[PDB]
Design an enzyme around this catalytic site. Structure first.
Site, PDB file in Angstrom:
ATOM      1  N   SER A  83       0.857  -1.193   0.000  1.00  0.00           N
ATOM      2  CA  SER A  83       0.000   0.000   0.000  1.00  0.00           C
ATOM      3  C   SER A  83       0.896   1.247   0.000  1.00  0.00           C
ATOM      4  O   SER A  83       1.518   1.568   1.008  1.00  0.00           O
ATOM      5  CB  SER A  83      -0.910   0.013   1.216  1.00  0.00           C
ATOM      6  N   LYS A  87      -0.946  -1.204  -4.467  1.00  0.00           N
ATOM      7  CA  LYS A  87      -2.210  -0.535  -4.241  1.00  0.00           C
ATOM      8  C   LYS A  87      -1.982   0.967  -4.141  1.00  0.00           C
ATOM      9  O   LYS A  87      -1.211   1.429  -3.290  1.00  0.00           O
ATOM     10  CB  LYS A  87      -2.888  -1.045  -2.975  1.00  0.00           C
ATOM     11  N   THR A  88      -2.675   1.705  -5.007  1.00  0.00           N
ATOM     12  CA  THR A  88      -2.532   3.154  -5.146  1.00  0.00           C
ATOM     13  C   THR A  88      -3.731   3.922  -4.555  1.00  0.00           C
ATOM     14  O   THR A  88      -4.844   3.392  -4.473  1.00  0.00           O
ATOM     15  CB  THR A  88      -2.370   3.534  -6.645  1.00  0.00           C
ATOM     16  N   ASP A 103      -7.284   1.731  -5.060  1.00  0.00           N
ATOM     17  CA  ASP A 103      -8.199   1.563  -3.920  1.00  0.00           C
ATOM     18  C   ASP A 103      -9.245   2.689  -3.876  1.00  0.00           C
ATOM     19  O   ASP A 103      -9.244   3.540  -2.977  1.00  0.00           O
ATOM     20  CB  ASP A 103      -7.381   1.566  -2.614  1.00  0.00           C
ATOM     21  N   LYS A 119     -12.724   2.252  -3.884  1.00  0.00           N
ATOM     22  CA  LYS A 119     -13.916   1.948  -3.106  1.00  0.00           C
ATOM     23  C   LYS A 119     -15.120   2.631  -3.711  1.00  0.00           C
ATOM     24  O   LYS A 119     -15.787   3.432  -3.044  1.00  0.00           O
ATOM     25  CB  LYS A 119     -13.734   2.397  -1.656  1.00  0.00           C
ATOM     26  N   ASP A 161     -21.388   4.011  -5.093  1.00  0.00           N
ATOM     27  CA  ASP A 161     -22.524   4.852  -5.507  1.00  0.00           C
ATOM     28  C   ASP A 161     -23.358   4.016  -6.454  1.00  0.00           C
ATOM     29  O   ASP A 161     -23.048   2.849  -6.688  1.00  0.00           O
ATOM     30  CB  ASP A 161     -22.011   6.119  -6.217  1.00  0.00           C
ATOM     31  N   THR A 198     -23.395   6.454 -11.868  1.00  0.00           N
ATOM     32  CA  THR A 198     -22.325   7.346 -11.378  1.00  0.00           C
ATOM     33  C   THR A 198     -20.938   6.686 -11.390  1.00  0.00           C
ATOM     34  O   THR A 198     -19.977   7.267 -11.908  1.00  0.00           O
ATOM     35  CB  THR A 198     -22.632   7.886  -9.949  1.00  0.00           C
ATOM     36  N   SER A 206     -11.074  -4.033   8.374  1.00  0.00           N
ATOM     37  CA  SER A 206     -10.240  -4.208   9.551  1.00  0.00           C
ATOM     38  C   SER A 206     -10.471  -3.148  10.643  1.00  0.00           C
ATOM     39  O   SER A 206      -9.881  -3.231  11.726  1.00  0.00           O
ATOM     40  CB  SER A 206      -8.778  -4.189   9.126  1.00  0.00           C
ATOM     41  N   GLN A 259      -7.984   1.601  13.095  1.00  0.00           N
ATOM     42  CA  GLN A 259      -7.279   0.490  12.430  1.00  0.00           C
ATOM     43  C   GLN A 259      -6.813  -0.535  13.462  1.00  0.00           C
ATOM     44  O   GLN A 259      -6.368  -0.164  14.545  1.00  0.00           O
ATOM     45  CB  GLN A 259      -6.082   1.010  11.621  1.00  0.00           C
ATOM     46  N   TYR A 263      -4.562  -4.285  13.727  1.00  0.00           N
ATOM     47  CA  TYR A 263      -3.629  -5.126  12.982  1.00  0.00           C
ATOM     48  C   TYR A 263      -3.679  -6.588  13.409  1.00  0.00           C
ATOM     49  O   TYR A 263      -3.850  -6.889  14.581  1.00  0.00           O
ATOM     50  CB  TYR A 263      -2.209  -4.588  13.119  1.00  0.00           C
ATOM     51  N   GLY A 315       0.859  -1.279   4.520  1.00  0.00           N
ATOM     52  CA  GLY A 315       1.294   0.089   4.187  1.00  0.00           C
ATOM     53  C   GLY A 315       2.359   0.599   5.135  1.00  0.00           C
ATOM     54  O   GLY A 315       3.546   0.425   4.879  1.00  0.00           O
TER      55      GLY A 315
HETATM   56  O1  LIG Z   1     -10.939  -2.378   5.170  1.00  0.00           O
HETATM   57  C1  LIG Z   1      -9.948  -1.738   4.744  1.00  0.00           C
HETATM   58  N1  LIG Z   1      -8.856  -1.575   5.500  1.00  0.00           N
HETATM   59  C2  LIG Z   1      -7.782  -0.895   5.056  1.00  0.00           C
HETATM   60  O2  LIG Z   1      -6.793  -0.773   5.809  1.00  0.00           O
HETATM   61  N2  LIG Z   1      -7.767  -0.316   3.765  1.00  0.00           N
HETATM   62  C3  LIG Z   1      -6.606   0.424   3.242  1.00  0.00           C
HETATM   63  C4  LIG Z   1      -6.367   1.737   3.972  1.00  0.00           C
HETATM   64  C5  LIG Z   1      -4.859   1.874   3.978  1.00  0.00           C
HETATM   65  O3  LIG Z   1      -4.445   2.681   2.873  1.00  0.00           O
HETATM   66  C6  LIG Z   1      -4.330   0.452   3.842  1.00  0.00           C
HETATM   67  C7  LIG Z   1      -3.855  -0.128   5.170  1.00  0.00           C
HETATM   68  O4  LIG Z   1      -2.447   0.056   5.273  1.00  0.00           O
HETATM   69  P1  LIG Z   1      -1.643  -0.022   6.668  1.00  0.00           P
HETATM   70  O5  LIG Z   1      -0.960  -1.366   6.584  1.00  0.00           O
HETATM   71  O6  LIG Z   1      -0.721   1.167   6.552  1.00  0.00           O
HETATM   72  O7  LIG Z   1      -2.673   0.075   7.776  1.00  0.00           O
HETATM   73  O8  LIG Z   1      -5.402  -0.349   3.349  1.00  0.00           O
HETATM   74  C8  LIG Z   1      -8.825  -0.455   2.965  1.00  0.00           C
HETATM   75  C9  LIG Z   1      -9.950  -1.151   3.388  1.00  0.00           C
HETATM   76  I1  LIG Z   1     -11.598  -1.335   2.108  1.00  0.00           I
HETATM   77  O1  LIG Z   2     -27.793   6.673  -2.335  1.00  0.00           O
HETATM   78  C1  LIG Z   2     -27.494   7.502  -3.221  1.00  0.00           C
HETATM   79  N1  LIG Z   2     -28.279   7.673  -4.290  1.00  0.00           N
HETATM   80  C2  LIG Z   2     -27.971   8.559  -5.252  1.00  0.00           C
HETATM   81  O2  LIG Z   2     -28.744   8.669  -6.228  1.00  0.00           O
HETATM   82  N2  LIG Z   2     -26.793   9.349  -5.158  1.00  0.00           N
HETATM   83  C3  LIG Z   2     -26.401  10.350  -6.159  1.00  0.00           C
HETATM   84  C4  LIG Z   2     -25.753   9.732  -7.384  1.00  0.00           C
HETATM   85  C5  LIG Z   2     -26.115  10.708  -8.477  1.00  0.00           C
HETATM   86  O3  LIG Z   2     -25.074  11.679  -8.620  1.00  0.00           O
HETATM   87  C6  LIG Z   2     -27.411  11.356  -8.005  1.00  0.00           C
HETATM   88  C7  LIG Z   2     -28.635  10.760  -8.674  1.00  0.00           C
HETATM   89  O4  LIG Z   2     -28.894  11.438  -9.895  1.00  0.00           O
HETATM   90  P1  LIG Z   2     -30.301  11.218 -10.635  1.00  0.00           P
HETATM   91  O5  LIG Z   2     -31.257  12.083  -9.854  1.00  0.00           O
HETATM   92  O6  LIG Z   2     -30.000  11.691 -12.032  1.00  0.00           O
HETATM   93  O7  LIG Z   2     -30.535   9.736 -10.499  1.00  0.00           O
HETATM   94  O8  LIG Z   2     -27.525  11.106  -6.608  1.00  0.00           O
HETATM   95  C8  LIG Z   2     -25.980   9.222  -4.108  1.00  0.00           C
HETATM   96  C9  LIG Z   2     -26.262   8.318  -3.106  1.00  0.00           C
HETATM   97  I1  LIG Z   2     -24.960   8.133  -1.473  1.00  0.00           I
END
Ligand SMILES: O=c1[nH]c(=O)n([C@H]2C[C@H](O)[C@@H](COP(=O)(O)O)O2)cc1I
Ligand SMILES: O=c1[nH]c(=O)n([C@H]2C[C@H](O)[C@@H](COP(=O)(O)O)O2)cc1I
Lengths: 255, 255
Positions: A34, A58-59, A89, A91, A94, A98, A149, A207, A209, A227
């Protein structure tokens, strides 16, 4: 139970996972770095120097103060040279319409350089359906966050079971999970586990470990994401080797 | 039931929510515009034209093909001129020490221009705690996602209850929720609801739409977030006024 190399050849294996499983076996590394850095140069230096010790980098391209797509051009160079996958990463979390744009577009164009990205399952299967529409064309894979975690994590019980189901029903795109342990009984899926250090501990913000032997050995995950355990050490090369050898022996022992 | 104007003077109310609620009352709008465009010139042309009609502009900076911090400056100028809040729909959903960096730093520097941001609760309160540390200095506020609009959404039951508790326990920085209904009876919290159109329907990737009258009127929400319902129209101003008038009359009927 099959070796990484055997798993790379399973019928239903996704190509991105197979490429990863093959270089894992070739290099004796189930370690994902990481690289949580602020400067493009930092990222390219670290990737290059530690490239031989990892299967995956992982970026967080959104914490780079000097991001450009040329920086990611040079990242792919090093990825091909040292043989590791790039995992952004992001995540995605939405609605499908989107996350589509987020994955393909904007300034990052994540889909144009990330072998893997991840997604939270909370929105329901549309987040993956949306990502698929960008990912399949560009031959990419995705990971589903089944567990976290952090203290107080709500990705437990029924939530975890929904993430696995989602995974199994989108196997042409989802190649595995972010999890704290093995959560699917299907060998085609990867398991990657963050919150990993050699010593007991956490940080000040939730966090927690566990060690590589616990996570890979006792909990049956495949890859450790690490990381600060490596970046904050004085010798990052030696640090990366320790985690590699720890996670690799734990895997060997498990077979 | 209290009016936006009364609620803005509530003893335990956040400076950002108070600012919001006053301009809502002053301008007779509880419409948030979701500007899901990929050109900075269109974002600014919509902000300028629709500014007077909106209480808030919700952005997705990471899908803008030509983002610069200068664009946000010009957005800030329009926001001051027309009195609306800027909300970046970033959906922070990582561990606390990670989200701090994503919120403050990197290319987007979200904290420097965004009045509100949102976060998922799945990681546990650490995510709020991480964001808090950056935002509290700058007098920012945060919305927690307690429910989602999309089909298959796992933000239900105990997960929602979790988001409510987390908000209540962090009122110094959480100013309310992204949700489909009123989930908190505490009047200091704002409820914002996406998945809103005038016409019945949905999209191809899990988005479900209800009307301003159902969401504000029956389900007790405060503000509607409306994207395509406005953006897809030929005349976006006429559309904004239509959503504004619908959501505002729906609000007046709750009193
Ligand atoms: O559940 C998660 N846990 C987590 O730790 N990360 C990411 C966040 C951080 O950038 C890295 C953990 O690195 P460390 O080993 O520095 O804690 O992984 C992502 C998720 I989804
Ligand atoms: O649970 C959610 N539902 C949702 O619709 N948006 C955002 C995503 C998008 O940018 C906008 C929906 O646009 P429309 O009204 O065009 O669907 O709302 C965000 C979340 I958190």
């Amino acid at each position: 139970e099959l070796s990484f190399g055997a798993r790379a050849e399973l019928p239903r294996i996704h190509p991105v996972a197979s490429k990863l499983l093959r270089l894992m076996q070739k290099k004796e590394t189930n370690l994902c770095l990481s690289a949580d850095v602020s400067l493009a140069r930092e990222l390219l230096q670290l990737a290059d120097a530690l490239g031989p010790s990892i299967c995956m980098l992982k970026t967080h391209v959104d914490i780079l103060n000097d991001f450009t797509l040329d920086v990611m051009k040079e990242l792919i160079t090093l990825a091909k040279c040292h043989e590791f996958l790039i995992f952004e990463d992001r995540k995605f979390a939405d609605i499908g319409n989107t996350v589509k744009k987020q994955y393909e577009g904007g300034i990052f164009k994540i889909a144009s350089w990330a072998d893997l990205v991840n997604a939270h399952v909370v929105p329901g299967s549309g987040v993956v359906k949306g990502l698929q529409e960008v990912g399949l064309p560009l031959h990419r894979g995705c990971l589903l966050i089944a567990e976290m975690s952090s203290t107080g994590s709500l990705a437990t019980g029924d939530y975890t079971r929904a993430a696995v189901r989602m995974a199994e029903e989108h196997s042409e795109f989802v190649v595995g999970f972010i999890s704290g342990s093995r959560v699917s009984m299907k060998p085609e899926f990867l398991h990657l586990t963050p919150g990993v250090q050699l010593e007991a501990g956490g940080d000040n913000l939730g966090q927690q470990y566990n060690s590589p032997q616990e996570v890979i050995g006792k909990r049956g995950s495949d890859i450790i994401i690490v990381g600060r355990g490596i970046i904050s050490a004085a010798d990052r090369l030696e640090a990366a080797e320790m985690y590699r050898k720890a996670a690799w022996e734990a895997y060997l022992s498990r077979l």
